[PDB]
């Protein structure tokens, strides 16, 4: 009795798709199996996302796993909410009310604000990506007013890959001489290297505002002077993660691009966890004996059973690669722990952790 | 030989629709006439906007006049760009590359930054609406870093209309005692009154960040102490505007809601100007002897003649209610002038103007 689902993947999201496939193997049973229909697309393109969503809807999927970005997030939220189709995603979380969107990614804003306070910063630069969310911006600016921080908030997004050289000049002119060397980097991974390379030096302290501090070669040179801190939602010392890596480290690269390593990007980890969440939801519908096509149809015809699937998804409580997984009624992660990292000559290390209830705890 | 166009109006945009209709009367000829197909919709709803756009596309329109907001702008940009359908709009302009979007609204950021510098402010509050754009925020924060301003940037958006009383308390606690009395208001008109009323006092200087300083009763009490400045893109002393008002002031309110007044909201003025722009573009196609249906069709079938209409629109150069109208290749207003206002016991008056080329010039 196969369960039809959609998968909407950004082009080039190879490791995430490998993790998706490994999840389907691990969490599928003999009798029950998810049957995904995959669309690879440019997620920044709202026309393309709308077309992919509608195609999935017309097929008759029971839920959609996928990604969005700043330009397409409203298409996903509005279409899911209108048609009662659940969208499970590792993409950036949103603060508004969004029925039918299950956001695998923990919120990071609280942990970031606690870390700023932990280091007792009162003046710093916040370099962010207009090609990314803005909830974190808002939260930082709003806290600055309350905490009396002096924040220099520069949208490093939309760089022509051209004037880039002449734009970092004006960037660092403001910082370098305002003797501002405390810097938060809240952008796409590549933008990190591009900014750090422009600095090279040891008097700086960077906070990397993402959930994958040790992901990829991001830390390509640990001998480089300068304090670097960040966040980690995948704890490689946890039993569940260690067992996963025992397999992931042995996979064939040809079959599973991005695997055959001892680490996994946090977005890929969340993708694997999303498969567990979906499988558990549908299994729970079966246990409870709950039996379960034109996008532009007027009037809109929402899926009648949509609310039952949405409910089952939000009620899932399991441990995964990203730790304890539990959702509130708005599809937001709750009761999750985020590990706080720190830079050392020999590598990264967990100095403490953050939870909603306790804020920051030092190890 | 009627020219089919779409019109996408926010519900309740009565004056704008009246101005649209007055434009069609003024700029239509005996032989050539625009034939609009109107959709009234919630522009914050991307599903609704997508449905309206696709319906217009399937009808076979030659262009669409309409509005978007922060939540639907990406739907409009992506669908227009993909299908080569031109969208002419008075809504907030965007900085990215957007083929096929003609933005009637001048950009205001440059004028605002020049005015801040003119008054020689170095410390001020920026009160903005999360229920509005964020380009201006970014620009102000980015300039603050360069100019060494101390900006207190408070997102006054999303007020529960409830905790409002307890939220303005914390707002003014930060300001009132930080002896910060220079204030920029960048929000929806109603939020202006709601904020000003919370202040009432004469030591304040407000800058109203919109293009309709004298629009509506915004200036409902001119005797109130406190310096107020702003921008006016409709100059009621200009010959063209005066002639328009000679008619607008006599119209029947029943037939033309929002008319029968001596002023017109800047959004309505831009709507009237959009009709002139569309009419001129199609007339120019005729002069040049240039002869001119499934949204989700795969593969996407862009309109072959789309590029000719887009070109004709961007080549239009006329004077309108919003002054000199001329576009760059990205559909952005250029060579426009914005009037700078100032508050007086007897009313508002023009102290100078701003252009991209010259920045601020004092009268």
CB of B143 within 8 Å of a chain A CB? The answer is: no
Chain B residue numbers touching A294 (CB-CB < 8 A): none
Strands B87-89 and B64-66 turn out to be parallel
Chain A residues lying within 8 Å of B153, measured CB to CB: 141, 145
Rounded to an integer, what is the distance from CA B248 to the centroid of its chain?
Answer: 20
Assess if CATH 3.40.50.2300 describes domain B107-236+336-363.
yes
**A194 Cα distance to chain centroid:** 21
Report helix, strand or coil for B44: coil
Pairing of the two strands B323-325 and B318-320: antiparallel
Do B1-106+237-335 and B107-236+336-363 fold alike per CATH? yes
Task: Indicate the SS3 state at residue B6.
Answer: strand
Q: Enumerate the residues of chain B whose CB falls inside 8 A of the CB of residue A77.
A: 46
Cβ neighbors of B45 (< 8 A, separation 6 or more) are A78, A82, B71, B72
Helix axes A306-314, A266-287, angle to 10 degrees: 120
Distance from CA of A193 to the nearest CA of B (A): 21
Minimal CA separation from B5 to chain A, in Å: 21
Domain-by-domain residue ranges, chain B? 1-106+237-335, 107-236+336-363
Q: Chain A, 147-206: which have a CB under 8 Å from a chain B CB?
A: 150, 152-155, 158, 170, 173-175, 178
- CA distances from residue B27 to B19, B90, B281 in whole angstroms, order as listed: 12, 18, 12
- Enumerate residues 6+ apart whose C-beta is below 8 A from B34: B2, B3, B5, B24, B28, B275, B278, B279, B282
CB-based contacts of B282-291 (< 8 A; 24+ apart in sequence) = B282/B3, B282/B32, B282/B34, B282/B62, B282/B312, B283/B32, B284/B312, B284/B315, B284/B316, B285/B309, B285/B312, B286/B32
Q: What is the DSSP letter of A333?
A: B
Q: B96 at the A interface (CB within 8 A)?
A: yes
Asked if B208 and B229 touch (Cβ cutoff 8 Å), the reply is yes
- B33 lies within 8 A of chain A by CB: no
Q: What residues of A are in contact with residue B95 (Cβ under 8 Å)?
A: 158
Q: How far apart are CA A234 and CA A343, in angstroms?
A: 17
Chain A interface includes B296 (CB < 8 A)? yes
Nearest CB to B46; choose among A78, A146, A298: A78
Select the CATH number that applies to the domain covering B1-106+237-335 from these four: 3.90.1660.10, 3.40.50.620, 3.40.50.720, 3.40.50.2300: 3.40.50.2300
A65, A279 Cβ separation under 8 angstroms: no
Residues of B in contact with A173 (CB under 8 A): 146
Experimental approach taken: X-ray
Locate the chain A residue with the closest alpha carbon to B136: A155
**Please, are residues B206 and B183 in contact by the beta-carbon 8 Å criterion?**
yes
Alpha-carbon dihedral B86, B92, B95, B100, rounded to 10 degrees: 0
Write out chain B residues lying below 8 Å of A130, CB-based.
138
Residues 67-86 of B with CB under 8 A from A: 71-72, 74-75, 77-79, 81-83
Residues of chain A with Cβ-Cβ distance to B148 below 8 Å are 178
**3-state SS, one letter per residue, for B294-346:** CCCCCCCCCCCCHHHHHHHHHCCCEEECCEEECECCCCEECCCCEEEEEEECC
Beta B347-355 vs B359-362: how paired, if at all? antiparallel
Resolution (A): 4.1
A-B C-beta contacts closer than 8 Å: 95
Beta-carbon neighbour count of residue B349 at 10 Å? 13
Q: Across the interface, do B50 and A48 touch by the CB < 8 Å criterion?
A: no
Q: What secondary structure does DSSP assign to A248-313, as a single string?
A: HTTS-TTTSTT-SSS---HHHHHHHHHHHHHHHHHHHHHHTT-----TT-SS----TTHHHHHHHH
CA A132 from centroid of its chain's CA atoms: 11
Question: Which of chain A's residues have a Cβ under 8 Å away from the Cβ of B71?
Answer: 74, 78
Q: Which of B54, B145, B154 sits opposite A174 (nearest CB)?
A: B145
Closest listed residue to residue B56, CA positions, set B46, B66, B45, B69: B66
The answer to whether the CB atoms of A174 and B146 lie below 8 A apart is yes
A142·B154 Cβ contact <8 A: yes
């Amino acid at each position: 009795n196969s369960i039809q689902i959609g998968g909407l993947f950004p082009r080039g999201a190879d490791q995430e798709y490998s993790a998706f496939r490994v999840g389907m193997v691990q969490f599928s049973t003999s009798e029950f199996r998810l049957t995904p229909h995959i669309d690879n697309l440019e997620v920044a393109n709202s026309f393309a996302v709308t077309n992919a969503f509608c195609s999935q809807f017309s097929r008759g999927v029971y839920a959609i796993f996928g990604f969005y970005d700043k330009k397409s997030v409203n298409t996903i939220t509005s279409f899911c909410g209108t048609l009662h189709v659940s969208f499970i995603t590792p993409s950036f979380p949103t603060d508004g009310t969004h029925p039918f969107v299950i956001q695998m990614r923990p919120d990071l804003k609280g942990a970031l604000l606690s870390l700023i306070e932990y280091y007792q910063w009162d003046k710093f630069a916040y370099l962010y990506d207009s090609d990314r969310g803005l909830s974190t911006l808002q939260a930082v600016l709003d806290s600055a007013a309350e905490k009396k921080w002096q924040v220099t908030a520069i949208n490093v997004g939309n760089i022509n890959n051209d004037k880039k050289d002449e734009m970092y000049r004006s960037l660092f002119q403001d910082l370098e001489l305002k003797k501002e060397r405390r810097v938060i980097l809240d952008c796409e991974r590549d933008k990190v290297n591009d900014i750090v390379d422009q600095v090279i030096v040891k008097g700086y302290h960077y906070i990397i505002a993402n959930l994958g501090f040790t992901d990829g070669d991001l830390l390509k040179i640990q001998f480089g002077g300068a304090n670097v801190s960040g966040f980690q939602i995948v704890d490689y010392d946890d039993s569940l993660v260690s067992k996963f890596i025992e397999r992931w480290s042995t996979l064939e690269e040809k079959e599973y691009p991005g695997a055959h390593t001892t680490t996994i990007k946090y977005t890929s980890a969340l993708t694997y966890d999303a498969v567990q969440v979906m499988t558990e939801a549908f299994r729970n519908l079966r246990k409870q004996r709950i039996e379960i096509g034109d996008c532009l149809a007027n009037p809109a015809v929402p899926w009648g059973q949509g609310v039952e699937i949405e409910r089952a998804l939000k009620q899932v409580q399991v441990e995964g690669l990203s730790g304890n997984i539990k959702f509130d009624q708005n599809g937001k992660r709750i009761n999750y722990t985020i590990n706080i990292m720190e830079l050392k000559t020999n590598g990264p290390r967990k100095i403490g952790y953050w939870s909603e209830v306790d804020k920051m705890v030092v190890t």
